[PDB]
Amino acid sequence: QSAQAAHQALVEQLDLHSIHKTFRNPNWRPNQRRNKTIKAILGESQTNIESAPSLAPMKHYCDVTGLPAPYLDPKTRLRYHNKEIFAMIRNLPQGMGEQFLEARGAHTV
Amino acid sequence: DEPWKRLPPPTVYPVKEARFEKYIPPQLDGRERALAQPPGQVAIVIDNGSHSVRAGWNFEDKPRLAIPPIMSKYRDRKMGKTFSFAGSDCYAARSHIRNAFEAGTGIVSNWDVMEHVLDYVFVKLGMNEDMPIVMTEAVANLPYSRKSMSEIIFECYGAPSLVYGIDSLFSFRHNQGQTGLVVSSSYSATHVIPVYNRKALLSQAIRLNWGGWHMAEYMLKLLKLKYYTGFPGKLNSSQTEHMVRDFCYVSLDYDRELAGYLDWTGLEDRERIVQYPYTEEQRDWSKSLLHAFRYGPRPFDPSSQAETHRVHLNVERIRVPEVLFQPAAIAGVDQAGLVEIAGDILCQRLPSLPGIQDAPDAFLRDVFLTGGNTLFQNFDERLRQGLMALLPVGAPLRVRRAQDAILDAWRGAAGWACTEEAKAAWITREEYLEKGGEYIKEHDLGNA
Amino acid sequence: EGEVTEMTPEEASTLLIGLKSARGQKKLRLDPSIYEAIQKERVQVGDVIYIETNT
Numbered sequence: 001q002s003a004q005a006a007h008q009a010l011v012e013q014l015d016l017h018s019i020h021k022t023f024r025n026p027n028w029r030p031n032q033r034r035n036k037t038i039k040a041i042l043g044e045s046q047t048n049i050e051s052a053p054s055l056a057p058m059k060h061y062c063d064v065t066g067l068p069a070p071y072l073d074p075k076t077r078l079r080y081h082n083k084e085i086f087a088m089i090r091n092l093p094q095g096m097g098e099q100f101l102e103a104r105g106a107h108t109v
Numbered sequence: 110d111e112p113w114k115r116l117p118p119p120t121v122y123p124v125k126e127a128r129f130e131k132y133i134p135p136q137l138d139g140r141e142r143a144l145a146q147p148p149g150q151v152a153i154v155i156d157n158g159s160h161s162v163r164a165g166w167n168f169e170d171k172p173r174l175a176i177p178p179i180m181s182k183y184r185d186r187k188m189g190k191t192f193s194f195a196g197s198d199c200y201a202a203r204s205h206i207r208n209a210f211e212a213g214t215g216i217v218s219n220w221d222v223m224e225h226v227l228d229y230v231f232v233k234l235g236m237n238e239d240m241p242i243v244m245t246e247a248v249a250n251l252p253y254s255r256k257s258m259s260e261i262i263f264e265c266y267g268a269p270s271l272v273y274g275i276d277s278l279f280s281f282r283h284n285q286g287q288t289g290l291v292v293s294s295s296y297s298a299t300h301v302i303p304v305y306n307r308k309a310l311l312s313q314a315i316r317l318n319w320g321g322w323h324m325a326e327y328m329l330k331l332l333k334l335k336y337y338t339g340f341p342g343k344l345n346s347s348q349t350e351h352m353v354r355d356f357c358y359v360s361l362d363y364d365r366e367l368a369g370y371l372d373w374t375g376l377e378d379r380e381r382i383v384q385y386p387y388t389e390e391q392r393d394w395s396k397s398l399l400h401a402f403r404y405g406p407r408p409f410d411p412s413s414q415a416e417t418h419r420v421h422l423n424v425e426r427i428r429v430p431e432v433l434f435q436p437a438a439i440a441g442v443d444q445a446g447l448v449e450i451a452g453d454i455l456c457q458r459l460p461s462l463p464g465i466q467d468a469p470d471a472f473l474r475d476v477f478l479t480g481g482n483t484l485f486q487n488f489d490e491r492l493r494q495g496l497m498a499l500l501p502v503g504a505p506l507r508v509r510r511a512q513d514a515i516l517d518a519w520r521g522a523a524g525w526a527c528t529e530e531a532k533a534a535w536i537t538r539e540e541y542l543e544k545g546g547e548y549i550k551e552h553d554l555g556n557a
Numbered sequence: 558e559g560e561v562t563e564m565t566p567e568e569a570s571t572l573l574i575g576l577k578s579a580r581g582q583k584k585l586r587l588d589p590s591i592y593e594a595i596q597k598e599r600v601q602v603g604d605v606i607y608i609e610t611n612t
């Protein structure tokens with residue numbers, strides 16, 4: 001199929017691997033473990049330490065709709081705007097309450 | 110009555126994605142003129158952006174290349190051969206993509222991906238056996254990451270000299286920056302850096318861990334929650350990034366604009382509707398706040414394939430930019446907001462410094478906005494109003510846009526690249542062999 | 558008229574009161590007796606207060 005042949009032509013035209021990089025030193029080879037994570041790199045250092053929490057009190061927003069929330073649900077710990085959203089919050093499927101806390105970074109773990 | 114019957118048919122915008130579009134042959138024209146340019150006055154300029162790697166020749170006004178820092182490599186089972194890609198050639202059709210940076214972080218971490226990106230950069234620049242290299246660097250880049258990047262440049266590519274500088278600060282000097290407060294919001298982070306006598310006070314810089322990547326991720330969560338019952342389209346972070354770019358804006362009065370945002374009157378104008386591609390073969394919805402939130406003023410039926418395949422952004426038009434100003438309240442980032450960060454610098458830190466002269470007033474006369482993630486509407490105006498309330502009355506506060514928010518850091522690095530100031534800061538290969546890649550020349554635009 | 562940003566004593570009794578509005582801040586050196594007037598009103602940091610500085 002010409003479209004597939006053209007697609008082959010594109011990837012063959014785009015591929016780097018078929019190209020010899022003459023500027024690349026052929027003798028140099030990396031340490032395979034070099035791809036450390038940022039947590040590991042900091043741990044191996046034991047300035048990229050650069051902010052702190054606010055002391056101003058925090059505004060309250062509805063976990064469902066982001067509108068201002070007067071209310072904090074005791075049961076599910078979601079903040080909610082009104083009786084319509086409280087009703088919906090109490091009828092969420094299993095685990096959806098934690099899914100709303102995850103957007104706030106407040107999930108149970 | 111049926112007020113929605115009065116409304117026009119909704120205007121709807123197609124989804125957009127990061128996509129392949131055009132090939133780029135090796136630009137050997139550039140190599141030829143680079144050899145013609147005067148001695149000691151050519152360099153390769155690499156803005157090492159987590160959103161886009163920008164590269165080109167110092168003697169030119171634009172990068173010749175702008176490429177996502179991604180690779181794709183796979184063994185094709187049918188052609189029997191390896192394929193390798195770096196950048197938009199990854200179509201971003203197997204999409205086995207890997208990214209050079211750690212997620213949401215301005216620091217390079219996949220060095221094999223980084224080498225593939227640089228190979229692509231040099232091939233497209235036409236390097237065919239070299240010029241010295243100017244590399245932009247994260248504001249407090251980790252020593253190990255500086256070490257690793259140096260090793261690749263000197264030992265794999267053999268380059269004669271390398272210098273690292275900070276994209277925020279190059280942008281400032283390109284815009285006649287002399288003393289000021291540099292406010293950068295990038296893909297990876299938001300920074301506020303005081304700059305004095307053209308020299309940055311990096312000891313007084315602050316990083317907010319929110320940026321244009323985090324906005325795309327956060328917008329994705331909010332959409333997957335809004336339609337938690339099920340959206341048929343394949344929601345991904347790349348689509349929401351274009352939604353944040355196209356539709357979000359900063360509020361000038363968040364908690365009063367927000368409190369009325371879902372009111373039915375005029376929600377037809379406040380909502381914006383994104384269409385995913387589809388195939389076709391006394392108490393009701395008109396009083397439901399959740400209907401207005403999810404579907405706007407129009408009635409909804411799940412029979413219409415088109416209407417089932419569209420998202421309504423609504424409150425997320427303003428809720429997403431406001432994370433910069435209210436990180437803990439909107440997204441739970443336990444960090445001070447942008448106005449409180451910049452205010453604490455001007456109010457507390459700089460007037461405490463010895464020998465600083467007229468702090469804050471000297472800095473306050475040029476608050477400067479850098480980086481693509483500042484390009485939201487009202488971003489400057491919001492920052493001005495916020496700072497104005499923290500400063501003695503009548504203080505000469507100015508907030509200023511960079512002339513370009515994304516290329517301008519490369520343009521600054523390119524102009525600086527071959528100056529005597531830069532060439533004093535260059536590290537040669539032999540200096541690298543003496544000192545190792547962790548050593549760096551202290552200079553006004555670079556890390557300590 | 559503004560939100561109280563600071564209430565710092567500066568005398569053995571004279572305060573500095575910081576006042577804030579949406580348009581800027583100002584600091585006022587307080588006569589010891591108007592300070593007591595401010596103290597009989599239950600003013601604290603974060604309160605909004607009105608002051609007639611002449612009367």
Ligand SMILES: Nc1ncnc2c1ncn2[C@@H]1O[C@H](COP(=O)(O)OP(=O)(O)OP(=O)(O)O)[C@@H](O)[C@H]1O
Pocket residue numbers: 157158159160161215276294295296297298320321322350353354480481482483484485514515
């Ligand atoms: N017009 C626009 N309005 C809002 N955001 C935009 C606009 N154009 C681009 N952006 C966003 O700005 C970001 C790109 O920023 P930029 O290219 O300056 O970052 P970078 O240099 O890659 O970042 P870093 O220094 O973190 O590596 C992306 O999140 C992109 O979606």
Ligand SMILES: [Mg+2]
Pocket residue numbers: 157158159276295296480
């Ligand atoms: Mg950048």
